[PDB]
From a paper:
Unlike Cas9 and Cas12, Cas13 is an RNA-guided RNA endonuclease containing two HEPN (higher eukaryotes and prokaryotes nucleotide-binding) nuclease domains. [name] (also known as Cas13X.1) was recently identified as a minimal Cas13 protein (775 residues) and used for RNA knockdown in mammalian cells. The crystal structure revealed that [name] adopts a bilobed architecture consisting of the REC and NUC lobes, with the [name] DR anchored in the REC lobe. The NUC lobe comprises the HEPN1 and HEPN2 domains, while the REC lobe consists of the Helical-1, Lid, and Helical-2 domains.
To clarify the [name]-guided [name] recognition and cleavage mechanisms of [name], we determined the cryo-EM structure of dCas13bt3 in complex with a [name] (61 nucleotides) and its complementary [name] (25 nucleotides), at an overall resolution of 3.4 Å. The density was less clear for the NUC lobe as compared with the REC lobe, suggesting that the NUC lobe is relatively flexible in the ternary complex. Thus, we modeled the HEPN1/HEPN2 dimer structure in the binary complex into the density map as a single rigid body, except for a flexible loop in the HEPN2 domain (residues 703–729, referred to as an active site loop [ASL]), which was not resolved in the density map. The [name] spacer (G20–U1) base pairs with the [name] (A1–C20), while the terminal five base pairs (G21-C21–G25-C25) are disordered. The [name]-[name] duplex is bound to the groove formed by the Helical-1, Lid, HEPN1, and HEPN2 domains. Upon [name] binding, the HEPN1 domain moves away from the REC lobe, with IDL1 serving as a pivot point. In contrast, in the ternary complex, the short a helix is melted and residues 582–608 form a continuous a helix. These structural rearrangements of the HEPN1 and HEPN2 domains result in the formation of a binding groove for the [name]-[name] duplex. A structural comparison between the binary and ternary complexes revealed that, whereas the ASL is ordered and covers the HEPN1 active site in the binary complex, it is disordered and the HEPN1 active site is accessible in the ternary complex. In the [name]-[name]-[name] ternary complex, the HEPN domains move away from the REC lobe, and thus, the ASL becomes more flexible and dissociates from the HEPN active site, thereby allowing the access of ssRNA substrates to the catalytic residues.
Numbering used by the authors: 14 to 221, 238 to 269, 288 to 625, 635 to 702, 730 to 775
RNA sequence: GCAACCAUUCAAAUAUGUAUGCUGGAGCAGCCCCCGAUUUGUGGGGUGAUUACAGC
RNA sequence: AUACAUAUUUGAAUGGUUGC
């Protein structure tokens, strides 16, 4: 239990962790401070007070020296216990206590209740097992620390306590992934695109893998366009809905509202910002994939100049330029005005149509849809409109089937003279949401079917009181320009008779990928119904956007194709590299390719008879797991050797060093000699090595 | 042929926090209808607005 | 009830280990 109780061969789990800390300190000497500050870069709120931050900044040499001392202590049979003492004074102790209390707070505040206590890092001026685990965490990948904690925890009886304690102790540990300089998001996007493409389009699923539920084209397109074009940045959303262009938070969601995004293009003399729809986005992706991205972005950048030129000469400009201008501009210059009579007719027809459809659909409509309709009726009949609180309260009643409380609400509005007795009364004969909804539809349609009076024009929103100056509207418009639908199409494919889908198909066939979707083509067309009927248009468009997404995936894989000197065979359901076959999805969030020598030796030494393609699962079970098992035995053996004693020597040192550092830099013959010397000195183990 | 343990992915259920209204402007954008059409069209209409909008 | 985030439980698919 206490750290003092780990003597001789029992030290092994700590030997492995601390040697890895040194392995990693030799790759990067800055890891203590890097790890301590990792999370605080993402926090407005200080993780540390000012003096703590100061101590952290000075601590590299101290922490690196302590790392070496403990590695020495844990790698020897007998070492002086002095290194296990941290005084109250100790810089490292203060740092550790602050970092730990911070981690606990971070854990607890995300839980619904406080269930457990956390282990102390210190007892008097002596580090505990938990303290030693915490110290090493700063230097090692999550998998190393989990392996250590798994060996030394007294807490595994209670799964919940074990995992929460582990969460705190492992707060500051490195990501498993060697390649990740926190820009390996292309790996995750690759997997996400493949996962989405493998889901069957909803409409095809219902007719004939999981079902696709969400269209993620825009999300993928934004990640791809930002990766390809450093001049471009899309609006991110936060709720205080605020749109900003900060790339400080990677997790932060893109602003996507009704298939619109906000783009900022930084060219020439400074950034220009536009709203861009799905239509323009998908053409931009298509153009980017074919190497015309820079040119497309140049044309979008210049778009505002054209608008500004047209704005001065609306009356005289070519009618073709009217497309770039909102109604209010054209109407100001006497273009496309409609008689109030015509505006009334269109408005009333629409609102009538909306309410006839609601009336027909009551039984099929959601409680939210029905509640909104009922509230829209009450609100429009109120002297003073609902405040947010009043609205919320009544909505909660309707959604919760609390018709009694809703009717008590109407009574209160009546007693307050906000609604008249008629409005209260029309609901008195109803007991259900559906009945109330029908009554409301009837009252509204009665109002809309009247011979056109002054009250009607106001009711349907044609009655303006407040006058905004045209010149204010123009100014607003100029800072809120949206790209005309079909803009990029007209700039690049003016005289093209090929639709979007055919342009995508032509690029796919001739572009050099030689890929297509891995879903059966039947999932993109219902053979039994006409080309243009039902879901067939939407599925055909989906085939084109999926093909774009496949090409985006092919671009992303390209980045990790650039990294290292290993070939890729990429299938729908596997990646093969020189061979190891990663299954499930792509890898199943795996790595291992970063140490090619080690993977080579793992395969050579633990799987000598296997040739050609080997499953990752097999490499793990027969290789990495087998290595880990052997490593425990060799470290335990080496420590027991030291205890007892306190070409053969060469081999012993090399094999020892290999197992201490988690590599295979020795030959089979050399393990023979190591094994011989262990046998000669009393310490046997069931080596299970070398392999048949 | 079956069970247990570990790892990975998907679906479903439960709890907690936050949001949901009004007025004016905005329909270049998004969406829908009609008209064509191996399908998403710088073809015609709409859309009491869904809002990088201003206030209460 | 809808949207978003966090946490917990169950089932299904895949591989390995153990027992008969």
């Amino acid at each position: 239990l206490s750290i003092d109780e780990y003597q001789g061969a029992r030290k092994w789990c700590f030997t492995i962790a601390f040697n890895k800390a040194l392995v990693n300190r030799d790759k990067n000497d800055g890891l203590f401070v890097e790890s301590l500050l990792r999370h605080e870069k993402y926090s407005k709120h200080d993780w540390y007070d000012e003096d703590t931050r100061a101590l952290i900044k000075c601590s590299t040499q101290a922490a690196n020296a302590k790392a070496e001392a403990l590695a020495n202590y844990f790698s020897a049979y007998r070492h002086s216990p002095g290194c296990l003492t941290f005084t109250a004074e100790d810089e490292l102790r203060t740092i550790m206590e602050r970092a730990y209390e911070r981690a606990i707070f971070e854990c607890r505040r995300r839980e619904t209740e406080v269930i457990i206590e956390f282990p102390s890092l210190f007892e008097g001026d002596r580090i505990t097992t938990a303290g030693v685990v915490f110290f090493v965490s700063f230097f090692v990948e999550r998998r190393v620390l989990d392996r250590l904690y798994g060996a030394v925890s007294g807490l595994k009886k209670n799964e919940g306590q074990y995992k929460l304690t582990r969460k705190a102790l492992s707060m500051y540990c490195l990501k498993d992934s060697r390649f990740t300089k926190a820009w390996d998001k292309r790996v995750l996007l690759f997997r996400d695109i493949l996962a989405q493409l493998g889901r069957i389009p909803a409409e095809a699923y219902e007719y004939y893998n999981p079902k696709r539920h969400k269209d993620k084209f825009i999300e993928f397109a934004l990640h791809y366009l930002e990766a390809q074009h450093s001049e471009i940045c899309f609006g991110r959303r936060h709720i205080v809905v605020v749109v900003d262009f900060s790339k400080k938070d990677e997790d932060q969601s893109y602003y996507i509202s009704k298939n619109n995004v906000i783009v900022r293009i930084d060219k020439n003399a400074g950034p220009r910002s536009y709203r861009m729809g799905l239509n323009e986005l998908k053409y931009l992706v298509l153009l980017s994939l074919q190497g015309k991205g820079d040119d497309a972005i140049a044309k979008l950048y210049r778009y505002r100049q054209h608008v500004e030129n047209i704005l001065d000469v609306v009356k005289v400009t070519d009618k073709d330029n009217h497309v770039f201008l909102p109604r209010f501009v054209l109407e100001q210059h006497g273009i496309g005005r409609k008689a109030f009579k015509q505006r009334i007719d269109g408005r009333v027809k629409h609102v009538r149509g909306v309410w006839e459809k609601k009336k027909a659909a009551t039984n099929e409509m959601t409680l939210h849809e029905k509640a909104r309709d009922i509230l829209q009726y009450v609100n429009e009949n109120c002297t003073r409109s609902f405040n947010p609180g009043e609205y919320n309260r009544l909505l909660v009643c309707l959604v919760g089937k609390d018709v009694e409380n809703f009717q008590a609400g109407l009574k209160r509005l009546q007693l307050a003279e906000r609604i008249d007795g008629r409005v209260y009364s029309i609901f008195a004969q109803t007991s259900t949401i559906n009945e109330m909804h029908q009554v409301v539809c009837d009252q509204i349609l009665n109002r809309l079917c009247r011979i056109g009076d002054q009250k009607l024009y106001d009711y349907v929103g044609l009655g303006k009181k407040d006058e905004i100056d045209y010149k204010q509207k123009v100014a607003w418009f100029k800072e809120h320009i949206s790209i005309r639908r079909g803009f990029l199409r007209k700039k690049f494919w003016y005289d093209s008779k090929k639709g979007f889908a055919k342009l995508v198909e032509e690029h796919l066939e001739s572009g050099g990928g030689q890929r297509d979707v891995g879903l059966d083509k039947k999932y993109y067309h219902i053979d039994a119904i006409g080309r243009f009927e039902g879901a067939n248009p939407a599925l055909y468009e989906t085939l084109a956007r999926d093909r774009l997404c496949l090409m985006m995936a092919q671009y992303f894989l390209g980045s990790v194709r650039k990294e290292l000197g290993n070939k890729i065979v990429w299938s729908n359901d596997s990646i093969e590299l020189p061979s190891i076959v990663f299954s499930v999805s792509d890898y199943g969030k795996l790595y291992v390719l970063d140490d090619a020598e080690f993977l080579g030796r793992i395969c050579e030494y633990f799987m000598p008879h296997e040739k050609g393609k080997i499953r990752y699962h097999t490499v793990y079970e027969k290789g990495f797991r087998a290595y880990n098992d052997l490593q425990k035995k060799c470290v335990e053996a080496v420590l027991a050797f030291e205890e007892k004693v306190v070409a053969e020597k060469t081999a012993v040192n090399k094999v020892a060093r290999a197992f201490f550092a988690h590599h295979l830099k020795f030959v089979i013959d050399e393990f023979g000699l190591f094994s011989d010397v262990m046998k000669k000195y009393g310490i046997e183990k069931e080596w299970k090595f070398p392999v048949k």
